[PDB]
RNA sequence: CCCGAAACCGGUCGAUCUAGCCCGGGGCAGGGUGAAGUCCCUCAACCGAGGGAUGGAGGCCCGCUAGGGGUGCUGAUGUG
RNA sequence: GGGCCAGGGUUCCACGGCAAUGGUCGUCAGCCGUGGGUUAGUCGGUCCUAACCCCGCCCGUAACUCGGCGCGGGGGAAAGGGAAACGGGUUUAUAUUCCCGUACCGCGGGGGUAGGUGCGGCAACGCAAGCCCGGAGGGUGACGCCUCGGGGUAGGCGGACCGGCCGAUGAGGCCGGCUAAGCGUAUAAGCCCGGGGAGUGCCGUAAUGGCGAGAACCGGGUGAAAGCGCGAAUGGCCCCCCCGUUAGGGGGGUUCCGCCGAUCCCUGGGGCCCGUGAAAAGCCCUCCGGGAAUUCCGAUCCCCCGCGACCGUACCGAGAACCGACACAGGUGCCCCUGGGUGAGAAGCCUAAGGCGUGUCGGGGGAAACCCGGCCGAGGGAACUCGGCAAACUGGCCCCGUAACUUCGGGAGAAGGGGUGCCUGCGGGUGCGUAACCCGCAGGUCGCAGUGACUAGGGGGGCCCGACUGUUUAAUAAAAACACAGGUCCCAGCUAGCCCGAAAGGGUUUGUACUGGGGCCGACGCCUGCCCAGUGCCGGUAUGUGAAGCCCGGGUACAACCGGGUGAAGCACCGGUAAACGGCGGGGGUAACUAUAACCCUCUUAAGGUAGCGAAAUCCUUGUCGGUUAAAUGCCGACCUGCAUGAAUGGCGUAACGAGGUCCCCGCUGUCCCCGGCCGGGGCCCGGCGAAACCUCUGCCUGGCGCGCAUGCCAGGGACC
RNA sequence: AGGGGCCAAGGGUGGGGGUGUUCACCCAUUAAAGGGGAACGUGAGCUGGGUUUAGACCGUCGUGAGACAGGUCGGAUGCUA
């Protein structure tokens, strides 16, 4: 296409027309692994997808059911222990 | 730079100078945003000078 | 791409193109020898421009 | 006569001699609008980063009034250490309190010179100031140069030492690796000598290797002629 | 005899590469976490050290986790 | 009488050449050598000794890869 | 050759031509004439913001069309970030856009139902999302370097089948056999979760290595690419048999099986570091919830109605559309870097798809001399020349073997010696079962030669310089110069020092003595003597001295004016200071003997050349001696009295390194003795095409003369164009 | 076999080693290995090492810039009669 250089948004799959023309297509970059951030671990039940694709996809992928889907269940495993200690005293 | 002038000259290719919104001469340098001839972008005023330049065309016009 | 003209620049290019005609023969009759040569004739290659 | 010199260019703030300020990291602020007295203030080390232009490691700190600011990192800090600011801060390492509140004979850094201006003193890798004597009038602190400056007792400072020591213990290795460091900082280089610079370029030294006039220069000497050993009291290593 | 000094080749001269071989060798050594105490700490970066086990990251010397200057601070007391 | 140059000065106009500085991108066949780091065997109480593996560093080598430079031929040209 | 960015700007495309233009003709064309063509919800612009910029305001300036800060706003990438689409068909020219098919963005409705504003599963977890204006917060957007391994498939090739073709014999070879974006349903190494419970402590990866903050080992969950189906019997390839001036067509059949080998692309580990490696628009979630809720509500679930503000799209993109005045052998970005054979190869050669024969003047002379490219030369082996310059030789690869020196890293691919083809038959490795490759072994055998071509280091030693790599006079000097790492001296407590600015103000500085500013020297190894007299710098200064001001005296009806004290920095003056600039000497006399003088006198001017090194990157001079050459104004080693060495205006020495200077040796060789022949392009002729430099004139030669270095004067001679 | 002198240019009068070298020094040969002139013959012929450009170093000199017929490496050779 109009991008020639193999830039980042540019990257390529070979595409065939049946015409046998064989033309280059750009591909969207492949997904970086969202983190817990409260302790650095890639998150189970958290998708990978392209940052555009997440707009037109489903939200189920985008979280787990437990509170703070952003952090890992074990890190939450800290946080509740703290919250109660906090209500108790 | 000195000789080997042929070997050198692949720029000019890029343009930095045009038909001006204000005057119409060939000097509205796209990069500065300044017209060399008229002074548009730089000044509210037209460029005119004792030497002149601008004046000379105008007298010549008369 | 294209490049990549601005709309106006195309208007200007179009004008220069217009200037790059050859007069018509009838004017010429009307004149009865005459202003000729049409003086502007601009060649794509030969000449530049303005832009 | 000759052109402006290598130093005179520097002063213009022209871009070969302009520090990057967009790859560089925060400055120290302690903030005195929540004052020292009537303290309210603890924070948590949010992360630790390297600051390029300080050539030292620096800490991001998340305060508990809701402001985020950098404080120059002490040695032996953990991420999730609590740093306190005030006088009623514990007397331990990385904690920040006034000089009066700090014991005598303890190592200290990041000392204020005007109360509440955020640290303008001892903010380099591995070096530290010593509190030699304290009197309610004035507290005298001994600086990295061996030299004693009197400061107000109501200056802030942090207990401990700076991190990033051994810094000049390791060498720079090669001209390549060095080139790499100077881009990270700002320091006009490769820097040649005036001695084989032409008479136009530089005040001393001609075509070939030998000095013009003496290297040693006045303290009333002109701009653009104040190069060499500047106002040297002595030179050499002998009687 | 050579350290990590083999990278240098013929070059840099004895003292620098000897220094380099020694300083890198000790830099390579397993270091005791200030946080835990197991021998987990490795160098991420210049002056930045991190313990694999506990995950603690802290500032230290460029080559070593602790410098002799840093060591002095502990000794004066809280 | 007329012409004739190197200047000097004043106000302006250039970093599409080029120099360095910065942002954000991209390019560079193939091959070699082989460091640290790590491992094992056999032989010795230890000290070590012999062998082999694994790993893979370099302002590194070879290289008419692309690309950059331009030493000699004082060659070819030298109103190209 | 294919697709494109900039840039060009109609050069594109058709018809009609050739006066001009095209390095020649021209019926051709990029020329001339005349008409025509670039169509976008889903490509990009436009949006964001970077480095950075401007504007108002504040302020400066005599002032501005000038100037830097601080506020506030706005702008900044047609290769950053970023919403969504492909295929086929059609046109003279355009097309992801027009058409056909299939797919889909944004916003705005509508109709249903989950939803008493979600139900259901111990749990690791299930989708038909989560009422709502508002603002808040939080992840992801989001970024340096290089290996290795894991996956994807573009795609190269053998076998088999189906047609087309070529074809001694009817074999073998060539060829067509395709599947899109969009969906639906599946991804799975990373990464969590239960069970279990680390016995000489076990286990793994290609590897480093994990573990009692959960092992070995079993079940789960969980997030890139990938497969199938839809898309799609179509469409698109490929044939066959009929209709014919023509047009418009018709009916058919094939359109396939594996297994095997790869760039890139995407995903984990890991190594690195005195570069620790922008933002935001947007999503996704969460906190609060202004209000509306049971006649209810809401639409992330379905399905369905409507719409798309604006600019761009041609062609070229190049050894003729760019730029160099020229259609210039120049030189400017990407992408195709994995076509086949070759072979380590994006190498060469040959060759495929594809392109061209307009790198645009032809023909003739077997073409003689001469000139450029290039081929070959006996014998001899640098005798040439400043100089082996040029050129030659070696040559790939495998094996053997490998010195001096050394910073132990290297030197080193030292050096030198051997081998290498085809065939026939085996073995090993990896795997799965005989694939795809790779590594060896034996026998037979041909040539002059087996890297036979192309590709493809000549080697060795001493010395000088500079550590190296890099850089340098873009364009007569690439070096010994420069940088350089390392070393040292110096200055400054940040309200600094230094530096810029007319000013306001500013750089360093998101900087704070492990800083950052300025010089000197220039890697390592060993060292760095001695002098503060002179110059310079620095600190200080009773005393003398030292301006204007003020004071006092005098003068003047006032004033000018005259005199003295008071007199700061500055000077005189004192000390320090040479890894500051710099200096670092002369005569005589003397020792068993002839030599010299270890020895002893003398004086300038601060000190008196020390460690070293030395006839030098030392005059005389080709010193002298020795090596080396038959023979060497050389080189090298030595002595050394150095015309006119010497320690950070660095001394000495130095491994490694060099398109550096000089010398020697071996091989080799047309450099030479001494030149020949050949080949191709010119030369030379013809045809067409067609300039320049420069221009008082011209058939002389020799002597004399003369501005003393004459074709022209003078005297002879030669003399047809 | 010489020394010294006359006639005589018809012919001959070399090759190498050092040097940028005309000169000169040496070697081995040779009959002999003569001298001088021709824009110190010969650059619209070559060569371009040296002299006397612009780079650089050392010594001396000079406060310094900077200099040197001192030493030294490198430094283009146009034209269609």
UniProtKB/Swiss-Prot annotation, chain A:
Pfam families associated with the record: Ribosomal_L34e
Gene3D superfamilies per the UniProt record, alphabetical: 6.20.340.10
Name listed for the protein in its UniProt record: Large ribosomal subunit protein eL34
Alphabetic keyword roster: Ribonucleoprotein, Ribosomal protein
GO biological process: translation
Membership in a protein family: Belongs to the eukaryotic ribosomal protein eL34 family.
HAMAP family assigned to the protein according to its UniProt record, in alphabetical order: Ribosomal_eL34
Protein encoded by which gene: rpl34e
Any one Gene Ontology cellular component term annotated for this protein: ribonucleoprotein complex
Assembly: Part of the 50S ribosomal subunit.
PROSITE patterns registered for this protein in UniProt: RIBOSOMAL_L34E (PS01145)
PANTHER family: 60S RIBOSOMAL PROTEIN L34
Entry's Gene Ontology molecular function annotations: structural constituent of ribosome
Chain segments carrying region Disordered: 45-71
Domain of life: Archaea
From Swiss-Prot, chain C:
Keyword field contains Phosphoprotein: no
GO cellular component, one term: ribonucleoprotein complex
Cross-referenced Pfam families: Ribosomal_L39
GO biological process assignments: translation
Alphabetized InterPro entries for the sequence: Ribosomal_eL39, Ribosomal_eL39_CS, Ribosomal_eL39_dom_sf
Top-level taxon of origin: Archaea
Keywords associated with the record: Ribonucleoprotein, Ribosomal protein
An MF annotation (GO) of this entry: structural constituent of ribosome
Subunit structure: Part of the 50S ribosomal subunit.
Protein family according to the UniProt entry: Belongs to the eukaryotic ribosomal protein eL39 family.
HAMAP family xref list: Ribosomal_eL39 (MF_00629)
Protein's name according to its UniProt entry: Large ribosomal subunit protein eL39
Source organism of this protein record: Pyrococcus furiosus (strain ATCC 43587 / DSM 3638 / JCM 8422 / Vc1)
From Swiss-Prot, chain D:
Stored Pfam families: Ribosomal_L2, Ribosomal_L2_C
GO biological process: cytoplasmic translation
GO molecular function, one term: rRNA binding
SMART domains xref list: Ribosomal_L2, Ribosomal_L2_C
Keyword Ribonucleoprotein on entry: yes
InterPro entries: NA-bd_OB-fold, Rib_uL2_dom2, Ribosomal_uL2, Ribosomal_uL2_arc_euk, Ribosomal_uL2_C, Ribosomal_uL2_dom3, Ribosomal_uL2_RNA-bd_dom, Translation_prot_SH3-like_sf
GO cellular component, as recorded: cytosolic large ribosomal subunit
Keyword match Ribonucleoprotein: yes
Bias-annotated ranges (Basic residues): 222-239
Taxonomy, superkingdom: Archaea
Subunit structure: Part of the 50S ribosomal subunit. Forms a bridge to the 30S subunit in the 70S ribosome.
Role: One of the primary rRNA binding proteins. Required for association of the 30S and 50S subunits to form the 70S ribosome, for tRNA binding and peptide bond formation. It has been suggested to have peptidyltransferase activity; this is somewhat controversial. Makes several contacts with the 16S rRNA in the 70S ribosome.
Family the entry assigns: Belongs to the universal ribosomal protein uL2 family.
Protein name: Large ribosomal subunit protein uL2
Gene encoding the protein: rpl2
Swiss-Prot record, chain E:
Required co-factors: Zn(2+)
Cofactor note: Binds 1 zinc ion per subunit.
Zinc finger (C4-type): 33-54
One Gene Ontology cellular component annotation held by this UniProt entry: ribonucleoprotein complex
Coiled coil stretches, renumbered: none
Subunit structure: Part of the 50S ribosomal subunit.
NCBIfam families hit by this protein: eL43_euk_arch (TIGR00280), PRK03976.1 (NF003058)
Name listed for the protein in its UniProt record: Large ribosomal subunit protein eL43
Organism: Pyrococcus furiosus (strain ATCC 43587 / DSM 3638 / JCM 8422 / Vc1)
């Amino acid at each position: 296409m109009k991008p020639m250089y193999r830039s980042r948004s540019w990257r390529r799959k070979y595409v065939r027309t049946p015409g046998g023309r064989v033309v280059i297509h750009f591909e969207r970059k492949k997904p970086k692994i969202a983190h817990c951030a409260m302790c650095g671990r890639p998150l189970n039940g958290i998708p990978r997808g392209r940052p555009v694709e997440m707009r037109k996809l489903p939200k189920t992928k985008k979280r787990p059911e437990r509170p703070m889907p952003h952090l890992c269940p074990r890190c939450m495993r800290k946080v509740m222990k703290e919250q109660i200690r906090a209500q108790l005293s | 730079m000195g000789s080997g002038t042929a070997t050198f000259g692949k720029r000019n290719s890029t343009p930095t100078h045009i038909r001006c919104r204000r005057c119409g001469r060939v000097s509205y340098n796209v990069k500065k945003g300044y017209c060399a001839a008229c002074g548009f972008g730089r000044s509210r005023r037209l460029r005119k000078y004792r030497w002149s330049k601008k004046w000379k065309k105008k007298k010549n016009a008369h | 791409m294209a490049r990549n003209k601005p709309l106006a620049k195309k208007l200007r290019l179009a004008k220069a193109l217009k200037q790059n005609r050859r007069v018509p023969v009838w004017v010429i009759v009307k004149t009865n020898r005459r202003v000729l040569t049409h003086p502007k004739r601009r060649y794509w290659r030969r000449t530049k421009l303005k832009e | 006569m000759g052109k402006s010199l290598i130093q005179q260019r520097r002063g213009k703030g022209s871009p070969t001699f302009k520090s990057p300020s967009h790859r560089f990291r925060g400055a120290v602020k302690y903030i005195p609008l929540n004052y020292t007295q009537e303290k309210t203030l603890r924070g948590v080390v949010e992360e630790i980063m390297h600051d390029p232009g300080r050539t030292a490691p620096v800490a991001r700190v998340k305060f508990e009034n809701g402001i985020e600011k950098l404080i120059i990192a002490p040695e032996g800090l953990l991420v999730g250490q609590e740093i306190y600011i005030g006088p009623d801060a514990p007397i331990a390492v990385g904690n920040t309190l006034p000089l009066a509140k700090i014991p005598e004979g303890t190592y200290v850094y990041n000392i204020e010179g005007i109360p509440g201006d955020g640290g303008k003193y001892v903010r380099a890798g591995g070096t530290y100031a010593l509190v030699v004597s304290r009197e309610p009038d004035k507290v005298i602190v001994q600086l990295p140069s061996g030299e004693l400056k009197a400061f107000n007792p109501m200056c802030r400072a942090t207990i401990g030492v700076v991190a990033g020591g051994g810094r000049l213990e390791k060498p720079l290795v090669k001209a390549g690796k060095a080139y790499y460091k100077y881009k990270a900082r700002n320091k006009f280089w490769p820097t040649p000598r005036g001695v084989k610079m032409n008479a136009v370029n530089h005040p001393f030294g001609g075509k070939e290797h030998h000095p013009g006039k003496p290297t040693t220069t006045s303290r009333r000497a002109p701009p653009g002629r104040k190069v060499g050993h500047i106002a040297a009291r002595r030179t050499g290593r002998r009687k | 005899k050579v350290g990590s000094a083999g990278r240098f080749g013929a070059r840099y001269g004895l003292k620098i590469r000897r220094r380099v071989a020694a300083v890198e060798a000790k830099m390579r050594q397993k270091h005791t976490c200030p946080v835990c105490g197991r021998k987990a700490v490795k160098r991420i970066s210049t002056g930045i050290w991190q313990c694999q086990k506990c995950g603690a990251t802290f500032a230290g010397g460029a080559y070593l986790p602790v410098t002799p200057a840093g060591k002095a601070v502990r000794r004066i007391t809280e």
